[PDB]
């Protein structure tokens, strides 16, 4: 609920940071869709998001707040 709203705010931050690179935003969306559809483990999603946001270290740190513990 609060966590859902925090997730909405975070994904919006990604969308606006990559407003001129929609393919990167789209890739982030597909990482999550693939995670769910292929039942990938957390560590594989962590690897993919780390690579995607290599030049966006603040977005990477924000992502980690959604991970277990």
């Amino acid at each position: 609920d609060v966590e859902f709203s925090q997730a909405i705010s975070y994904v919006n931050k990604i969308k606006t940071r990559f407003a001129d690179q929609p393919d990167i935003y789209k890739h982030f969306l597909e990482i999550l869709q693939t995670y769910q559809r292929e039942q990938k483990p957390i560590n594989e999603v962590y690897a993919q998001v780390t690579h995607l946001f290599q030049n966006a270290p603040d977005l990477l740190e924000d992502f980690k707040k959604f991970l277990p513990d």
């Binding site: 909405i8 999550l32 995670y35």
Partner: peptide, 16 residues
């Protein structure tokens, strides 16, 4: 749109 955004939020918010 906001659909894709809310979908990603739902998946993200359920990993922990």
């Amino acid at each position: 749109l906001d659909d894709d955004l809310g979908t990603a939020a739902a998946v993200l918010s359920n990993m922990r």
